[PDB]
Amino acid sequence: KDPQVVCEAASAGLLKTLRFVKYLPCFQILPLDQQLVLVRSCWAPLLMLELAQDHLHFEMMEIHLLPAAAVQAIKSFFFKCWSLNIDTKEYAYLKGTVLFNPDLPGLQCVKYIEGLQWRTQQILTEHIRMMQREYQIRSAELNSALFLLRFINSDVVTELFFRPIIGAVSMDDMMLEMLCAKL
Amino acid sequence: DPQVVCEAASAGLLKTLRFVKYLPCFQILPLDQQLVLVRSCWAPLLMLELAQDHLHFEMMEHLLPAAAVQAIKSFFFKCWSLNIDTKEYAYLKGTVLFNPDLPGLQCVKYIEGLQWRTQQILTEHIRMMQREYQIRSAELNSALFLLRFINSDVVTELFFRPIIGAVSMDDMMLEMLCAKL
Amino acid sequence: ASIPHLILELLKCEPDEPQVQAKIMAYLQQEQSNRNRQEKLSAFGLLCKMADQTLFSIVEWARSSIFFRELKVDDQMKLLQNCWSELLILDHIYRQVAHGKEGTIFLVTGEHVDYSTIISHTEVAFNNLLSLAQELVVRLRSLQFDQREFVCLKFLVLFSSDVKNLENLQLVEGVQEQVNAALLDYTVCNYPQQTEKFGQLLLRLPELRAISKQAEDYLYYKHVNGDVPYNNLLIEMLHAKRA
C-alpha cells in the first residue's frame, strides 16, 4: 500500500535533505533569518531531488485527498531523472542550483548567493567535462529536469506526503525547528 | 668534444628546471617538497631533454664505468628509435617529475593525482592520432624503463665534473629553484 | 586609566572566553567520539575543525557587535570574506600574548603544547608559519599589549576600507577613522613612555596581512592533498576570496 510507508520514507527524505543543507559551510555561515528563507522555499524542490535519488517507487491509487495532474508532475519528474542516470555528484550540484537561488523573495544576501550559484555551476561544468564529454548536451539534459521540477507546488507535496503525519501544522514552522533540532 | 657537449648539457639542465619551476601546480609546494622532487627527477628529466634535442656525443679510452655509459647510450637510441613527438616528450617528463614513491614526500595524494592526469592527458593525444593504444603506450613505457639504470651520480661525472669541479649537484639545485624566483 | 566611549562598548562585544572553550571542546570531543567506521581526521583534520569553530565564533562575535549589526548581510559577508584569515590568526596571536609564555602554545580549546614538540611533529611548511607568528606574538608582548588595544585592532582589520564593492562604504570610512582616533587616545593614556606605540601597532598590521597569505597558501596546499576535512569552512572561505 501507499500511505503510512511512503509518508515515512518521504519524511525520512526530508531529514536527509536538511542535514545536507545544514552542514554546508557556505550555508551555516549565514544568519538564521536568511538561512530560514532559503530553506522555507527550496525544501520542496530539494525533497523531490532527494527522493528521485533514492529511487522512490510510490503509486497512489484513488479508488481533500486528490488533485489530478499535480501528482503527475511528480512522477514525470522522477522518471525524467531516472532516464537521465544522474550520479550522486550531479544530484548534489542540482540541489545546489535550487538552494542557491538569488531570485527568492526575502533575501538580503543576494550578491553572496550570486557567487555561490556561480561556483555551483562552475564545479558542475567541471565535473561534466571530467566524466564524459561535451557539456552542451548534458547541460540541457540537466536543466531539462530542473524545468520539470519548477511545476511541483509545495502545497501538493506537503499534502501528498506529510499531511498524514504532520496533521495540522505549518510546514514553515517545522523548518525552523529543523534548522535547530537534531544536529 | 668535452667543452662542446657539457656546454649544452647545462643548456638543457636549465631548460629543464625552468620548465618545472614555472609550472603552476609546482609553485604550490613548500619548496622543501618542491625540492625532494627535483633532487631525483633531475637526472632523468635531463636525459629526456637531451634526447629530445638529439644530443649526439661519443667517448674515448673518457673513463671506466661501462654499464653506466652503455645505459645512457641505449636510452637515447631507444628514444630516437621511437620517433617521440613534442607532446609525447612533454608528457613523459611529467611522468618522471611526479612519482609519489619518493621518500620524504608529504603530499603523496597530490602528486598521485598529477601523475594520473598526466597519463590521462597523454592517452588523449594518442587517441587523437596513432591508434592501437596498448602499443604506443607500452612502447613509451619502454623508454622510461631504461631510465631506472642511471644513478645520476654518473650523469654528474659525465657532463658536469669537467666544468663544476667539486661544488656538488646538490649545492647546484638549491640555487636553481630559488634563483629564478 | 580611563578609556574613550568607543573602546568601552567594544569590550562589551567580547565573546566571554569560558563560554566558548566549553562549546568548542565539547563539540570536538564529540566529533572524535562520533561513530564513523572510517574517517580518523586526525590530528590535522581535527585541528581544522577547531579552526572552523573559532571562525564560527568569530562571526558570531562579529554579527553580535554594535557597529557591525547595522549594515546588512551582503556587505557583512564581504568584510568577512577578506579578513577571515587575518582575524583567525590574530585571535591565536593574542591568545599567545595572554596565556602564551616560554615554548608553550595555548589553543583556543584551553589546551597547551610544547612549541618544540610541535615544531618537530610538523612539516617545514608549517614551521615557516608558526614561527612566523611567534616572531610577532613575542615581538609585540614586548610592546606591552593587552585586551584593550586588542579589540581595537580586531575592528580595524574587520573594517578595512581597502575593499571594493559595497554601498555603505561611508560606514567603514567612518569606523576606520573613528577607531584610529579612538585608539590614539588610549595609546598614551593608560601607558608610560611608548610615544610611537600607536604607529607601531598600526605597523604590525601588514606584517599580519602577510602571515595570512602564506597561511592560506598552506591551507590550499594541504587541501589539494586531500588532507582537509570534507565540509571544512576555511577552504570554503578561501574559494570565495581567492577566485
Side-chain angles (χ1 to χ4, degrees):
Chain A
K1 273 47 185 171
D2 334 320
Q4 41 289 132
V5 165
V6 307
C7 283
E8 166 212 58
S11 178
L14 212 193
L15 275 38
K16 300 186 186 72
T17 297
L18 299 216
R19 190 176 304 110
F20 165 74
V21 183
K22 219 172 165 183
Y23 287 154
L24 298 191
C26 41
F27 178 81
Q28 43 184 159
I29 204 188
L30 288 179
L32 182 71
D33 56 289
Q34 299 297 298
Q35 293 190 6
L36 185 59
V37 171
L38 289 180
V39 188
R40 284 201 167 172
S41 310
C42 306
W43 77 257
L46 290 181
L47 208 209
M48 286 307 102
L49 220 24
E50 269 294 336
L51 302 176
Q53 184 169 18
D54 285 46
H55 296 265
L56 196 180
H57 301 99
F58 86 95
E59 42 95 21
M60 225 284 167
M61 94 294 167
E62 229 59 43
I63 61 86
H64 193 95
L65 270 75
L66 70 103
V71 64
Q72 179 53 205
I74 296 185
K75 304 200 302 180
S76 311
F77 171 74
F78 275 38
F79 291 96
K80 203 63 205 293
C81 291
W82 295 332
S83 75
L84 276 172
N85 298 131
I86 312 177
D87 62 16
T88 56
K89 212 151 176 294
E90 291 149 1
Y91 269 115
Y93 307 121
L94 288 201
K95 304 190 185 68
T97 312
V98 175
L99 179 53
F100 306 117
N101 202 300
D103 296 325
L104 305 175
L107 292 183
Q108 303 169 20
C109 50
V110 180
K111 281 171 292 177
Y112 169 54
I113 304 189
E114 288 275 30
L116 274 166
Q117 182 199 169
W118 187 288
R119 265 204 302 169
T120 304
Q121 278 292 310
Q122 220 70 127
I123 181 174
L124 176 42
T125 304
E126 183 58 13
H127 169 282
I128 296 185
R129 182 206 59 85
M130 268 291 313
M131 287 307 291
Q132 70 172 20
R133 194 170 287 187
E134 198 138 356
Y135 184 82
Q136 287 294 156
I137 297 293
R138 225 317 167 91
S139 176
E141 294 196 344
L142 294 188
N143 299 343
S144 177
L146 289 168
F147 168 89
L148 198 47
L149 187 63
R150 34 163 44 92
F151 302 119
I152 298 289
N153 208 187
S154 276
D155 284 323
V156 202
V157 172
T158 80
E159 202 71 23
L160 172 59
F161 290 117
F162 293 91
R163 277 301 169 184
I165 307 179
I166 190 191
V169 164
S170 295
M171 186 84 275
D172 305 329
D173 306 7
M174 193 84 49
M175 311 320 292
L176 181 50
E177 275 285 10
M178 304 193 64
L179 286 178
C180 323
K182 53 160 184 312
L183 69 74
Chain B
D1 57 301
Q3 306 91 189
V4 188
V5 298
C6 298
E7 211 85 355
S10 306
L13 211 181
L14 173 57
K15 199 191 172 197
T16 287
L17 291 188
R18 185 171 296 171
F19 144 78
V20 171
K21 188 275 168 31
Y22 288 90
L23 220 56
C25 42
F26 190 65
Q27 325 276 199
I28 322 172
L29 284 156
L31 180 57
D32 60 304
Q33 295 299 302
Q34 169 177 135
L35 173 89
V36 176
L37 294 192
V38 182
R39 186 166 168 80
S40 307
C41 312
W42 80 275
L45 286 170
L46 212 195
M47 312 290 86
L48 270 157
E49 269 289 358
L50 309 176
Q52 197 174 3
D53 292 344
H54 301 93
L55 169 80
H56 169 99
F57 64 95
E58 305 189 358
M59 302 213 67
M60 203 171 311
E61 56 280 326
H62 302 95
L63 296 176
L64 174 62
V69 165
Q70 186 71 350
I72 306 177
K73 211 171 208 158
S74 300
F75 166 70
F76 285 87
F77 280 125
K78 169 150 270 300
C79 269
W80 296 328
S81 161
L82 295 166
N83 287 357
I84 303 172
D85 60 49
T86 324
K87 289 198 169 187
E88 292 172 326
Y89 262 118
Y91 308 139
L92 282 176
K93 298 207 193 71
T95 299
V96 187
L97 179 57
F98 315 131
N99 72 91
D101 293 42
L102 293 182
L105 281 158
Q106 295 267 128
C107 37
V108 179
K109 283 182 188 174
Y110 172 45
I111 52 204
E112 280 184 354
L114 290 184
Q115 167 70 251
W116 190 90
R117 293 182 183 174
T118 300
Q119 296 175 174
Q120 184 69 11
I121 183 176
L122 163 49
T123 290
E124 187 63 9
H125 173 82
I126 294 190
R127 231 84 175 190
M128 290 298 299
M129 40 192 52
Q130 316 181 41
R131 299 198 294 178
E132 278 282 34
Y133 182 82
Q134 276 58 37
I135 289 181
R136 168 94 277 192
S137 171
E139 216 166 26
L140 299 182
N141 272 242
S142 312
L144 271 30
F145 177 97
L146 266 313
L147 292 173
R148 307 277 199 75
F149 330 75
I150 282 197
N151 291 358
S152 159
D153 295 339
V154 188
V155 192
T156 300
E157 312 286 336
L158 265 281
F159 300 75
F160 306 107
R161 282 300 171 169
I163 303 297
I164 191 57
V167 189
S168 306
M169 294 295 312
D170 290 27
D171 299 4
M172 289 292 295
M173 304 315 183
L174 285 51
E175 168 65 27
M176 332 298 276
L177 303 183
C178 331
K180 323 162 307 302
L181 178 54
Chain C
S2 295
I3 343 291
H5 299 103
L6 281 288
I7 303 77
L8 292 179
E9 291 199 343
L10 297 189
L11 306 161
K12 302 181 179 178
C13 310
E14 285 313 287
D16 212 335
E17 253 206 26
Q19 193 80 190
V20 171
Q21 302 190 355
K23 171 189 164 190
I24 298 193
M25 184 181 57
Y27 167 86
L28 300 182
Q29 174 65 14
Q30 210 294 329
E31 278 296 348
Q32 41 189 353
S33 185
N34 180 302
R35 62 247 290 276
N36 284 357
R37 49 188 295 179
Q38 273 61 104
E39 180 179 0
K40 321 301 170 286
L41 287 305
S42 175
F44 167 86
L46 184 144
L47 282 168
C48 307
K49 295 191 170 304
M50 196 200 82
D52 277 347
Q53 297 299 151
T54 309
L55 219 191
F56 281 129
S57 175
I58 291 185
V59 187
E60 303 170 0
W61 164 90
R63 274 193 280 268
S64 188
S65 165
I66 169 175
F67 294 94
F68 190 89
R69 275 175 294 191
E70 54 205 54
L71 171 63
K72 313 228 71 175
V73 54
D74 250 325
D75 284 2
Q76 300 187 10
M77 301 294 304
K78 302 192 174 182
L79 278 190
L80 297 177
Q81 285 181 170
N82 197 192
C83 55
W84 66 273
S85 49
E86 315 197 20
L87 302 175
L88 203 56
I89 281 164
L90 176 47
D91 186 351
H92 160 80
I93 284 172
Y94 173 82
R95 197 180 306 105
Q96 302 310 321
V97 158
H99 307 68
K101 297 181 183 180
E102 56 151 22
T104 52
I105 283 280
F106 208 90
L107 308 185
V108 84
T109 63
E111 291 185 337
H112 37 70
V113 285
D114 311 331
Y115 185 91
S116 301
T117 308
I118 293 307
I119 205 281
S120 52
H121 274 104
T122 61
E123 43 198 319
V124 158
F126 179 77
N127 300 161
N128 295 357
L129 205 62
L130 174 48
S131 295
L132 194 51
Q134 287 292 12
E135 182 181 346
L136 211 49
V137 162
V138 176
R139 200 55 173 182
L140 167 151
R141 169 204 287 103
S142 309
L143 275 51
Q144 289 84 33
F145 181 85
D146 204 15
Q147 181 190 20
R148 274 144 300 285
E149 323 93 298
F150 167 62
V151 194
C152 299
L153 298 167
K154 297 176 79 176
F155 286 84
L156 284 171
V157 174
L158 179 38
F159 290 85
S160 177
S161 51
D162 295 359
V163 188
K164 199 59 188 63
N165 299 168
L166 53 170
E167 312 83 358
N168 205 356
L169 180 59
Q170 284 41 286
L171 175 42
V172 293
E173 293 295 54
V175 287
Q176 177 72 356
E177 310 159 347
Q178 182 166 169
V179 181
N180 271 208
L183 177 69
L184 183 46
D185 292 4
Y186 177 98
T187 297
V188 57
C189 282
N190 202 344
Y191 285 100
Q193 355 63 183
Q194 312 286 353
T195 300
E196 295 171 346
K197 181 175 181 191
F198 170 93
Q200 304 306 344
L201 296 180
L202 197 70
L203 188 160
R204 271 52 213 295
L205 282 191
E207 303 192 348
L208 149 142
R209 286 188 153 190
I211 315 186
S212 284
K213 294 184 186 174
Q214 307 191 9
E216 289 160 13
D217 292 355
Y218 178 76
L219 181 72
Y220 194 76
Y221 154 74
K222 266 305 195 182
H223 152 54
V224 186
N225 202 53
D227 293 4
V228 158
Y230 176 55
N231 256 348
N232 181 285
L233 175 58
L234 309 181
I235 43 172
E236 228 312 309
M237 285 289 322
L238 174 43
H239 290 112
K241 174 187 181 174
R242 183 55 56 93

